[PDB]
Amino acid sequence: RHVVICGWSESTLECLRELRGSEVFVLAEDENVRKKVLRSGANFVHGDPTRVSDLEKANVRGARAVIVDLESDSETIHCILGIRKIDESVRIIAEAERYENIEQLRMAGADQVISPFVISGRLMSRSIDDGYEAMFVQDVLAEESTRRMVEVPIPEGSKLEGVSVLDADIHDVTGVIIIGVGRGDELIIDPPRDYSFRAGDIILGIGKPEEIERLKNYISALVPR
Amino acid sequence: RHVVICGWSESTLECLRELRGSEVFVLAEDENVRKKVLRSGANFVHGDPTRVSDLEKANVRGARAVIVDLESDSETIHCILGIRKIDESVRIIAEAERYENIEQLRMAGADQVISPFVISGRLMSRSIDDGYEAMFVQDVLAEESTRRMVEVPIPEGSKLEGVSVLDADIHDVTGVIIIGVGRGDELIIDPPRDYSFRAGDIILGIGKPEEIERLKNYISALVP
Ligand SMILES: [Ca+2]
Numbered sequence: 437r438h439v440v441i442c443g444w445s446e447s448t449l450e451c452l453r454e455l456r457g458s459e460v461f462v463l464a465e466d467e468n469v470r471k472k473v474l475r476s477g478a479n480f481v482h483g484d485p486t487r488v489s490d491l492e493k494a495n496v497r498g499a500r501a502v503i504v505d506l507e508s509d510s511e512t513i514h515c516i517l518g519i520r521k522i523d524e525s526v527r528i529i530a531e532a533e534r535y536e537n538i539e540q541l542r543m544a545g546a547d548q549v550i551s552p553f554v555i556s557g558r559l560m561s562r563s564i565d566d567g568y569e570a571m572f573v574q575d576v577l578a579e580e581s582t583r584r585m586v587e588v589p590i591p592e593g594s595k596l597e598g599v600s601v602l603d604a605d606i607h608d609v610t611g612v613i614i615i616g617v618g619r620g621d622e623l624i625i626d627p628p629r630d631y632s633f634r635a636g637d638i639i640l641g642i643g644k645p646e647e648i649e650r651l652k653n654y655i656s657a658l659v660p661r
Numbered sequence: 662r663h664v665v666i667c668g669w670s671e672s673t674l675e676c677l678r679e680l681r682g683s684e685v686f687v688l689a690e691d692e693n694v695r696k697k698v699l700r701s702g703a704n705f706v707h708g709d710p711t712r713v714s715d716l717e718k719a720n721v722r723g724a725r726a727v728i729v730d731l732e733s734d735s736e737t738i739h740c741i742l743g744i745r746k747i748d749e750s751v752r753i754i755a756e757a758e759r760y761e762n763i764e765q766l767r768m769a770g771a772d773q774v775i776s777p778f779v780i781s782g783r784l785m786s787r788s789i790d791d792g793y794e795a796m797f798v799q800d801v802l803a804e805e806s807t808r809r810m811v812e813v814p815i816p817e818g819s820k821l822e823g824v825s826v827l828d829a830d831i832h833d834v835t836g837v838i839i840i841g842v843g844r845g846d847e848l849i850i851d852p853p854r855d856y857s858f859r860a861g862d863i864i865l866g867i868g869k870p871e872e873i874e875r876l877k878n879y880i881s882a883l884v885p
């Protein structure tokens with residue numbers, strides 16, 4: 437199991453740091469970065485992320501995911517198109533440089549498009565009086581963070597299958613704040629009364645590590661007599 | 662009140678979208694971006710963001726905050742230093758596209774640094790299996806969305822002065838989920854039931870527009 441990164445930028449550098457301990461391959465046109473990629477804990481492949489043969493050389497086929505961030509959005513689109521020819525099942529995550537290009541990255545094949553500047557502009561507008569929201573968005577997104585945002589799936593046979601958020605009382609049992617539930621293509625915030633947890637749901641929660649393990653055990657199957 | 666933006670890029674373009682309604686002044690060297698800044702709803706000031714005289718021309722003194730978004734690392738620093746020569750009472754928020762320059766920005770006196778690529782890279786690493794965490798950022802930050810994150814300050818004279826979060830029962834009363842409370846320069850995520858609110862505390866919550874305005878009224882002042 438392994439991850440592929442197309443393009444080397446400050447974003448994919450940050451990405452790789454977060455992937456410490458996992459197998460990762462980086463594909464870029466600049467040979468000069470090999471040493472830093474290596475010390476950053478990835479395997480480096482010198483080549484062109486828009487050319488199929490090179491994406492293939494970088495183990496895109498059967499990758500757990502491919503992360504793409506080339507210098508322009510048109511290069512990123514071409515890489516996306518090349519990846520899809522190789523493997524139609526592989527998850528593709530793409531950074532967009534300019535807002536007007538977001539849908540074209542999706543149309544090309546990205547399962548998800550991240551727009552650093554859109555996120556930045558939004559935080560900027562929220563940071564006029566203080567920095568607490570940016571404090572928050574940084575306090576949670578980092579793996580190294582103490583109290584972090586985590587995803588925990590509702591397993592098959594869960595205690596909570598068919599049970600609503602109110603009956604669940606997760607925050608009392610576990611200490612975890614439920615900030616969302618990921619189901620199918622949608623993320624639901626503050627689920628209403630008529631929401632029941634279904635196996636396969638992804639709980640987006642915030643909590644210290646021991647509160648997280650508490651949640652995981654809590655949502656398990658009823659142990660019969 | 663008014664806000665000043667030094668520089669222009671995709672970041673400040675999006676920023677203006679969420680500031681439509683505010684008086685915003687954009688100061689930038691590239692005359693070519695006037696038309697776009699104007700359509701975006703800000704007033705355009707042509708000039709040099711590193712220069713005290715042009716920063717003053719852009720209404721920096723007395724400004725609620727200045728946002729600095731310059732391609733040059735060294736210019737960002739000189740911009741920060743120029744603002745501070747004009748008015749130390751201004752909140753300064755600076756964008757860093759290079760991690761290397763963050764400490765230089767703080768040394769110069771930036772109050773806050775935003776690093777788009779740290780957030781982006783972290784979101785990339787959180788998105789290997791699914792995109793829910795990044796969806797939580799698209800959904801919650803776009804002020805033009807259904808259920809967003811809001812800062813609501815506790816006004817002096819608030820009904821909730823000295824009132825504990827358990828006793829406050831905010832989520833039950835208003836529908837807003839409390840994520841954290843900010844006091845001073847610390848953000849307390851998920852404050853314990855016996856934490857007592859104070860004027861000047863900033864409640865971080867997520868809710869619908871009506872829940873939010875419900876919370877603003879709930880914590881409103883006692884105005885005899
Ligand atoms: Ca990039």
Ligand SMILES: [Ca+2]
Nearest residue numbers: 670672730756
């Ligand atoms: Ca910038």
